[PDB]
Amino acid sequence: GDRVADVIESSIGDSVSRALTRALPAPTGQDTQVSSHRLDTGKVPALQAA
Amino acid sequence: SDRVAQLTIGNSTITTQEAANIIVGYGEWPSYCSDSDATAVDKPTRPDVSVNRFYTLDTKLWEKSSKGWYWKFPDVLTETGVFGQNAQFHYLYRSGFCIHVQCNASKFHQGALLVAVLPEYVIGSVAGGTGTEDTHPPYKQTQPGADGFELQHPYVLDAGIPISQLTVCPHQWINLRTNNCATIIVPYINALPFDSALNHCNFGLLVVPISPLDYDQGATPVIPITITLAPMCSEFAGLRQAVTQ
Protein backbone atom coordinates (compact mmCIF):
# COMPACT_ATOMS: atom_id res chain seq x y z
CA GLY A 1 0.00 0.00 0.00
CA ASP A 2 0.92 3.64 0.57
CA ARG A 3 3.34 4.16 3.46
CA VAL A 4 5.75 6.80 2.18
CA ALA A 5 4.70 10.42 2.66
CA ASP A 6 5.51 11.50 -0.89
CA VAL A 7 2.99 8.93 -2.14
CA ILE A 8 0.33 9.34 0.57
CA GLU A 9 0.26 13.14 0.18
CA SER A 10 0.78 13.00 -3.59
CA SER A 11 -1.66 14.92 -5.79
CA ILE A 12 -1.21 12.37 -8.60
CA GLY A 13 -4.63 11.20 -9.77
CA ASP A 14 -6.51 14.43 -9.04
CA SER A 15 -8.52 14.56 -12.27
CA VAL A 16 -10.63 17.60 -11.37
CA SER A 17 -9.87 20.54 -13.67
CA ARG A 18 -9.47 23.58 -11.44
CA ALA A 19 -11.37 26.29 -13.32
CA LEU A 20 -10.71 29.84 -12.13
CA THR A 21 -13.88 31.05 -13.88
CA ARG A 22 -17.50 29.93 -13.93
CA ALA A 23 -20.19 30.72 -16.47
CA LEU A 24 -22.84 33.18 -15.31
CA PRO A 25 -26.17 33.86 -17.02
CA ALA A 26 -26.29 37.08 -19.04
CA PRO A 27 -29.57 37.33 -20.98
CA THR A 28 -29.10 41.05 -21.69
CA GLY A 29 -26.29 43.58 -21.83
CA GLN A 30 -24.95 44.85 -18.53
CA ASP A 31 -26.69 47.82 -16.94
CA THR A 32 -24.92 51.13 -16.37
CA GLN A 33 -25.01 52.42 -12.81
CA VAL A 34 -24.90 56.02 -11.61
CA SER A 35 -21.44 57.53 -11.19
CA SER A 36 -20.24 60.86 -9.83
CA HIS A 37 -17.02 62.87 -9.87
CA ARG A 38 -14.29 60.99 -8.01
CA LEU A 39 -11.13 62.77 -6.84
CA ASP A 40 -8.92 60.41 -4.82
CA THR A 41 -5.29 59.32 -4.71
CA GLY A 42 -3.61 55.93 -4.61
CA LYS A 43 -6.52 54.15 -6.27
CA VAL A 44 -6.66 54.38 -10.06
CA PRO A 45 -8.98 52.39 -12.36
CA ALA A 46 -7.85 54.16 -15.54
CA LEU A 47 -4.24 52.99 -15.52
CA GLN A 48 -4.03 49.30 -16.46
CA ALA A 49 -1.39 46.87 -17.73
CA ALA A 50 -2.05 45.08 -21.01
CA SER B 1 -61.50 81.69 -14.87
CA ASP B 2 -60.50 80.29 -18.25
CA ARG B 3 -59.97 83.47 -20.27
CA VAL B 4 -57.23 84.91 -18.02
CA ALA B 5 -54.02 82.94 -17.63
CA GLN B 6 -50.39 83.40 -16.62
CA LEU B 7 -47.52 81.15 -17.68
CA THR B 8 -44.29 81.45 -15.69
CA ILE B 9 -41.16 79.39 -16.30
CA GLY B 10 -37.50 80.12 -15.63
CA ASN B 11 -37.11 83.87 -15.17
CA SER B 12 -39.80 84.86 -17.69
CA THR B 13 -43.55 85.36 -17.24
CA ILE B 14 -46.21 85.57 -19.96
CA THR B 15 -49.70 86.83 -19.13
CA THR B 16 -52.93 86.92 -21.12
CA GLN B 17 -56.42 88.29 -20.50
CA GLU B 18 -58.22 86.76 -23.51
CA ALA B 19 -56.85 83.21 -23.44
CA ALA B 20 -58.67 80.17 -24.82
CA ASN B 21 -57.44 77.44 -22.45
CA ILE B 22 -54.23 75.43 -22.90
CA ILE B 23 -53.67 72.46 -25.22
CA VAL B 24 -51.33 69.73 -24.00
CA GLY B 25 -49.94 67.97 -27.06
CA TYR B 26 -51.42 64.46 -27.20
CA GLY B 27 -52.44 64.74 -23.55
CA GLU B 28 -48.91 64.35 -22.23
CA TRP B 29 -46.80 66.76 -20.22
CA PRO B 30 -43.07 67.09 -20.95
CA SER B 31 -40.97 64.82 -18.75
CA TYR B 32 -37.36 63.77 -18.33
CA CYS B 33 -36.15 60.61 -20.02
CA SER B 34 -36.62 57.51 -17.89
CA ASP B 35 -33.64 55.30 -17.10
CA SER B 36 -35.37 52.41 -18.91
CA ASP B 37 -35.67 54.53 -22.07
CA ALA B 38 -32.27 56.24 -22.07
CA THR B 39 -29.56 54.72 -24.24
CA ALA B 40 -26.60 57.07 -23.77
CA VAL B 41 -24.37 56.18 -20.83
CA ASP B 42 -23.00 59.65 -20.04
CA LYS B 43 -24.86 61.68 -17.43
CA PRO B 44 -26.99 64.31 -19.20
CA THR B 45 -26.88 67.95 -18.18
CA ARG B 46 -30.12 69.63 -17.06
CA PRO B 47 -29.46 73.38 -16.95
CA ASP B 48 -33.09 73.99 -15.88
CA VAL B 49 -33.87 77.72 -15.46
CA SER B 50 -31.12 78.88 -17.81
CA VAL B 51 -32.85 77.23 -20.79
CA ASN B 52 -36.48 76.64 -19.68
CA ARG B 53 -37.67 80.19 -20.29
CA PHE B 54 -39.93 82.04 -22.71
CA TYR B 55 -38.04 83.21 -25.81
CA THR B 56 -39.62 85.90 -28.00
CA LEU B 57 -37.97 85.18 -31.32
CA ASP B 58 -39.61 87.23 -34.08
CA THR B 59 -42.68 89.22 -35.08
CA LYS B 60 -44.63 88.64 -38.29
CA LEU B 61 -47.15 91.08 -39.73
CA TRP B 62 -50.56 89.64 -40.57
CA GLU B 63 -52.01 91.09 -43.77
CA LYS B 64 -55.26 90.64 -45.68
CA SER B 65 -53.35 88.67 -48.35
CA SER B 66 -51.00 86.65 -46.13
CA LYS B 67 -50.58 82.96 -46.94
CA GLY B 68 -49.14 81.70 -43.65
CA TRP B 69 -45.83 80.96 -41.94
CA TYR B 70 -44.12 78.00 -40.30
CA TRP B 71 -41.23 77.53 -37.88
CA LYS B 72 -39.03 74.51 -37.21
CA PHE B 73 -38.12 73.26 -33.73
CA PRO B 74 -35.63 73.43 -32.09
CA ASP B 75 -34.09 75.17 -35.11
CA VAL B 76 -35.60 78.48 -33.98
CA LEU B 77 -33.54 78.25 -30.78
CA THR B 78 -30.37 76.59 -32.13
CA GLU B 79 -28.90 80.12 -32.20
CA THR B 80 -30.57 81.78 -29.20
CA GLY B 81 -29.10 82.21 -25.74
CA VAL B 82 -27.93 79.57 -23.29
CA PHE B 83 -30.31 77.08 -24.90
CA GLY B 84 -28.62 77.57 -28.26
CA GLN B 85 -25.19 77.37 -26.67
CA ASN B 86 -26.07 74.06 -25.01
CA ALA B 87 -27.60 72.71 -28.22
CA GLN B 88 -24.38 73.60 -30.07
CA PHE B 89 -22.04 72.13 -27.44
CA HIS B 90 -24.07 68.94 -26.91
CA TYR B 91 -24.72 66.21 -29.46
CA LEU B 92 -27.94 64.85 -27.95
CA TYR B 93 -31.15 66.75 -27.30
CA ARG B 94 -34.43 66.21 -25.49
CA SER B 95 -37.03 68.74 -24.41
CA GLY B 96 -40.68 69.64 -24.54
CA PHE B 97 -42.02 73.03 -25.57
CA CYS B 98 -44.68 75.57 -24.63
CA ILE B 99 -45.58 77.66 -27.68
CA HIS B 100 -47.51 80.88 -27.05
CA VAL B 101 -48.57 82.73 -30.21
CA GLN B 102 -49.64 86.34 -29.66
CA CYS B 103 -51.94 88.10 -32.11
CA ASN B 104 -53.98 90.96 -30.66
CA ALA B 105 -56.54 93.11 -32.44
CA SER B 106 -59.58 95.26 -31.63
CA LYS B 107 -63.24 94.33 -31.42
CA PHE B 108 -63.76 95.67 -34.96
CA HIS B 109 -61.13 93.41 -36.54
CA GLN B 110 -61.90 89.93 -37.83
CA GLY B 111 -59.94 86.89 -38.93
CA ALA B 112 -58.98 83.41 -37.79
CA LEU B 113 -55.54 81.86 -37.37
CA LEU B 114 -54.93 78.12 -37.24
CA VAL B 115 -51.96 77.45 -34.96
CA ALA B 116 -50.94 73.79 -35.16
CA VAL B 117 -47.94 71.63 -34.29
CA LEU B 118 -47.06 69.03 -36.92
CA PRO B 119 -44.31 66.59 -35.89
CA GLU B 120 -41.71 65.72 -38.53
CA TYR B 121 -43.09 68.38 -40.87
CA VAL B 122 -41.09 67.52 -43.97
CA ILE B 123 -41.17 70.33 -46.53
CA GLY B 124 -41.37 69.32 -50.18
CA SER B 125 -40.65 71.27 -53.34
CA VAL B 126 -43.03 72.10 -56.18
CA ALA B 127 -41.05 69.65 -58.34
CA GLY B 128 -40.77 72.23 -61.09
CA GLY B 129 -44.53 72.65 -61.35
CA THR B 130 -45.21 69.75 -63.72
CA GLY B 131 -43.59 67.22 -61.38
CA THR B 132 -40.91 65.88 -63.75
CA GLU B 133 -38.07 67.63 -61.87
CA ASP B 134 -36.61 65.97 -58.76
CA THR B 135 -35.92 69.10 -56.73
CA HIS B 136 -35.22 69.45 -53.02
CA PRO B 137 -35.93 72.50 -50.85
CA PRO B 138 -32.86 74.61 -50.06
CA TYR B 139 -31.21 74.75 -46.66
CA LYS B 140 -32.79 78.14 -46.01
CA GLN B 141 -36.23 76.57 -46.57
CA THR B 142 -35.82 73.25 -44.74
CA GLN B 143 -34.14 75.03 -41.78
CA PRO B 144 -35.52 78.58 -41.96
CA GLY B 145 -34.17 79.59 -38.55
CA ALA B 146 -35.76 82.18 -36.29
CA ASP B 147 -37.35 84.06 -39.20
CA GLY B 148 -39.64 81.18 -40.13
CA PHE B 149 -40.77 80.79 -43.71
CA GLU B 150 -43.84 81.90 -45.64
CA LEU B 151 -45.85 79.06 -47.16
CA GLN B 152 -46.17 79.10 -50.94
CA HIS B 153 -49.23 76.82 -51.17
CA PRO B 154 -50.83 76.71 -47.71
CA TYR B 155 -53.62 74.49 -49.02
CA VAL B 156 -51.14 71.60 -49.33
CA LEU B 157 -48.80 73.08 -46.68
CA ASP B 158 -46.00 72.85 -49.29
CA ALA B 159 -45.97 69.12 -48.51
CA GLY B 160 -48.93 67.62 -50.38
CA ILE B 161 -51.07 67.38 -47.24
CA PRO B 162 -54.38 69.30 -47.02
CA ILE B 163 -54.64 71.89 -44.28
CA SER B 164 -58.29 70.91 -43.79
CA GLN B 165 -57.07 67.84 -41.88
CA LEU B 166 -54.35 69.73 -39.97
CA THR B 167 -56.60 69.96 -36.90
CA VAL B 168 -55.85 66.29 -36.10
CA CYS B 169 -52.55 67.62 -34.69
CA PRO B 170 -52.45 69.64 -31.44
CA HIS B 171 -53.86 73.00 -32.48
CA GLN B 172 -55.62 76.15 -31.31
CA TRP B 173 -57.57 78.86 -33.12
CA ILE B 174 -56.79 82.56 -32.81
CA ASN B 175 -60.13 84.08 -33.80
CA LEU B 176 -59.68 87.80 -33.20
CA ARG B 177 -63.28 88.21 -32.08
CA THR B 178 -62.69 86.18 -28.89
CA ASN B 179 -59.06 85.26 -28.16
CA ASN B 180 -55.72 86.89 -28.96
CA CYS B 181 -53.38 84.06 -27.93
CA ALA B 182 -52.87 80.34 -28.51
CA THR B 183 -51.03 78.12 -26.04
CA ILE B 184 -49.80 74.65 -27.03
CA ILE B 185 -47.65 72.46 -24.78
CA VAL B 186 -45.78 69.87 -26.84
CA PRO B 187 -43.83 66.98 -25.27
CA TYR B 188 -40.83 65.40 -26.94
CA ILE B 189 -42.08 63.68 -30.10
CA ASN B 190 -39.51 61.34 -31.63
CA ALA B 191 -38.76 57.66 -32.16
CA LEU B 192 -35.54 58.10 -30.14
CA PRO B 193 -34.93 59.11 -26.51
CA PHE B 194 -32.39 61.67 -27.74
CA ASP B 195 -31.56 63.24 -31.09
CA SER B 196 -29.34 65.93 -32.57
CA ALA B 197 -30.69 69.44 -32.02
CA LEU B 198 -29.08 70.68 -35.26
CA ASN B 199 -29.66 67.98 -37.89
CA HIS B 200 -33.14 66.82 -36.84
CA CYS B 201 -36.22 69.02 -36.42
CA ASN B 202 -38.67 67.26 -34.11
CA PHE B 203 -41.75 69.23 -35.17
CA GLY B 204 -42.85 72.28 -37.11
CA LEU B 205 -45.25 74.96 -35.93
CA LEU B 206 -47.73 76.27 -38.51
CA VAL B 207 -49.58 79.59 -38.29
CA VAL B 208 -51.94 79.84 -41.26
CA PRO B 209 -54.80 82.37 -41.48
CA ILE B 210 -57.83 80.38 -42.62
CA SER B 211 -60.25 83.35 -42.60
CA PRO B 212 -58.59 86.43 -44.13
CA LEU B 213 -58.01 89.45 -41.93
CA ASP B 214 -60.40 92.31 -42.59
CA TYR B 215 -61.18 95.76 -41.20
CA ASP B 216 -62.61 99.02 -42.45
CA GLN B 217 -60.13 101.67 -43.55
CA GLY B 218 -59.02 103.82 -40.64
CA ALA B 219 -58.37 101.10 -38.07
CA THR B 220 -54.86 99.98 -37.16
CA PRO B 221 -53.54 98.27 -40.33
CA VAL B 222 -50.52 96.63 -38.66
CA ILE B 223 -51.62 93.44 -36.89
CA PRO B 224 -48.43 91.69 -35.74
CA ILE B 225 -48.12 88.00 -34.93
CA THR B 226 -45.49 87.26 -32.29
CA ILE B 227 -44.24 83.79 -31.39
CA THR B 228 -43.14 83.15 -27.81
CA LEU B 229 -41.97 79.74 -26.69
CA ALA B 230 -40.26 78.02 -23.77
CA PRO B 231 -38.50 74.63 -23.73
CA MET B 232 -39.64 72.32 -20.96
CA CYS B 233 -37.58 69.62 -19.23
CA SER B 234 -34.61 70.18 -21.53
CA GLU B 235 -31.78 67.64 -21.46
CA PHE B 236 -28.44 67.59 -23.26
CA ALA B 237 -25.76 64.94 -23.69
CA GLY B 238 -22.60 64.21 -25.65
CA LEU B 239 -20.59 67.36 -25.01
CA ARG B 240 -17.88 68.36 -27.47
CA GLN B 241 -16.64 71.53 -29.17
CA ALA B 242 -19.35 73.85 -30.43
CA VAL B 243 -20.87 73.20 -33.86
CA THR B 244 -22.52 76.13 -35.62
CA GLN B 245 -24.78 74.23 -38.05
Automatic annotation (TrEMBL), chain B:
Cellular localisation: Host cytoplasmic vesicle membrane; Host nucleus; Virion
Function recorded in the entry: Protein 3A: Localizes the viral replication complex to the surface of membranous vesicles. It inhibits host cell endoplasmic reticulum-to-Golgi apparatus transport and causes the disassembly of the Golgi complex, possibly through GBF1 interaction. This would result in depletion of MHC, trail receptors and IFN receptors at the host cell surface. Capsid protein VP0: Component of immature procapsids, which is cleaved into capsid proteins VP4 and VP2 after maturation. Allows the capsid to remain inactive before the maturation step.
Family, per entry: Belongs to the picornaviruses polyprotein family.
Assembly with partners or alone: Interacts with protein 3CD. Interacts with capsid protein VP0 and capsid protein VP1 to form heterotrimeric protomers. Five protomers subsequently associate to form pentamers which serve as building blocks for the capsid. Interacts with capsid protein VP4 in the mature capsid. Interacts with protein 2C; this interaction may be important for virion morphogenesis.
Protein name, entry field: Genome polyprotein
Residues of the full protein shown: 79 to 323 of 2193
